[PDB]
């Protein structure tokens, strides 16, 4: 019932990492309501207005030499630093998937609880990879530092058929596999 | 490629600020403003790292000053409501008598205010439920998870109700075994 006007200001320091900490790019973004108004890109070393509303801030902040220098140093003092402080429980994090198969006409391969999110999931009917007929849920963040996904296979199975969902993920050396045949 | 975001906000009139760190879309931690302390998204993290919470209070004080300046410069132009997509799902596939977790996923919305209520069998649950803070997105909207542990059964049914100023009426989101 609260219809009062809302006003929002957001500040985001984005640290982008390529090949360990080999290439670091810092991106400070200023957003009013839904409109980013001014940013500092390390690739540039100065603030730039993104829209008119941000012009006064870029011009003004660009005139503070001591602070600008500090921002240019941030790739080392701030990004690379935090990268190291936190890298042993974030980047190195590995949590192994859990796989389950079951009919939903349609076979489902549930793969859940895993981290990181880069994963490979493939179906086989009687030993030959099936690719036509495969639909998926996409990747899904649970917000608790784990992912999940459903990979469906569309088929009508003759009995005595052995479908097999295989999953590959950096957490485990050998591909996980789960078998599923229908009954008469 | 990895991305570590330090994301801060301040919202008026609600007078709420937030300060958190994001790794590839997951919260590393945030600072509880009321308690003036650091809350790690997984307690484990706290074994390896520390973060002076008082730091965030000073940033928030600046963010607030800036919001007021900016509110005026815009000629008191308010944020446009963007209502969330809400979806309900579980930690794992569910088998009766095995403890699972219901997740209420609230996505693509602004401003960062929502009333979220869990219902077991039509009645409001507030014990064991938990939630994340408002998580950042490229398009500068937010997202958020609410969680409810449960013991799956045929006897029981669930809904997640979500209120946001951008919705004509509350979203009810049903789940049952």
């Amino acid at each position: 019932g609260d219809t009062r006007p809302r006003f929002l200001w957001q500040l985001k320091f984005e640290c982008h990492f390529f090949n360990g900490t080999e290439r670091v790019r810092l991106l400070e973004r200023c957003i009013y309501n839904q409109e980013e108004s001014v940013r500092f890109d390390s690739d540039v070393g100065e603030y730039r207005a993104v829209t008119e509303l941000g012009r006064p801030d870029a011009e003004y902040w660009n005139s503070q030499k001591d602070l600008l220098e500090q921002r240019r140093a941030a790739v080392d003092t701030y990004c690379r630093h935090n990268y190291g402080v936190g890298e042993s429980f974030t980047v190195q994090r590995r949590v192994e998937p859990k796989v389950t198969v079951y009919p939903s006409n349609l076979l489902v391969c549930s793969v859940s609880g895993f981290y990181p999110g880069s994963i490979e999931v493939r179906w086989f009917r009687n030993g030959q990879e099936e690719k036509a007929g495969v639909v998926s849920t996409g990747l899904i963040q649970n917000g608790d530092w784990t992912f999940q996904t459903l990979v469906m296979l569309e088929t009508v199975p003759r009995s005595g058929e052995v479908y097999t969902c295989q999953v590959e993920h950096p957490s485990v050396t050998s591909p996980l596999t789960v078998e599923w045949r229908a009954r008469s | 490629e990895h991305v570590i975001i330090q994301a801060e906000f301040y919202l008026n009139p609600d007078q709420s600020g937030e300060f958190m760190f994001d790794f590839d879309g997951d919260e590393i931690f945030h600072v509880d403003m009321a308690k003036k302390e650091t809350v790690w998204r997984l307690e484990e993290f706290g074994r390896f790292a520390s973060f002076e919470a008082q730091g965030a209070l000073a940033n928030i004080a600046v963010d607030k000053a800036n919001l007021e300046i900016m509110t005026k410069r815009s000629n008191y132009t308010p944020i446009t409501n963007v209502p969330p997509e809400v979806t309900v799902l579980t930690n794992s596939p569910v088998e009766l008598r095995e403890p699972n977790v219901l997740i209420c996923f609230i996505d693509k919305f602004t401003p960062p205010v929502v009333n979220v209520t869990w219902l077991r069998n039509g009645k409001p649950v507030t014990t064991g439920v938990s939630e994340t803070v408002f998580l950042p997105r490229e398009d500068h909207l937010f997202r958020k998870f609410h969680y409810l542990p449960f013991l799956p059964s045929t006897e029981d049914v669930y809904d997640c109700r979500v209120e946001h100023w951008g919705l004509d009426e509350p979203l009810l989101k049903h789940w049952e075994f």
């Binding site: 320091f13 003004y60 602070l67 936190g86 | 730091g55 000073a58 600046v62």
Partner: peptide
């Protein structure tokens, strides 16, 4: 006028 907030640092715990 507008002021710049500070990039903040996590720290390693003595292990």
């Amino acid at each position: 006028k507008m002021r710049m907030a500070t990039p903040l640092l996590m720290q390693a715990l003595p292990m």
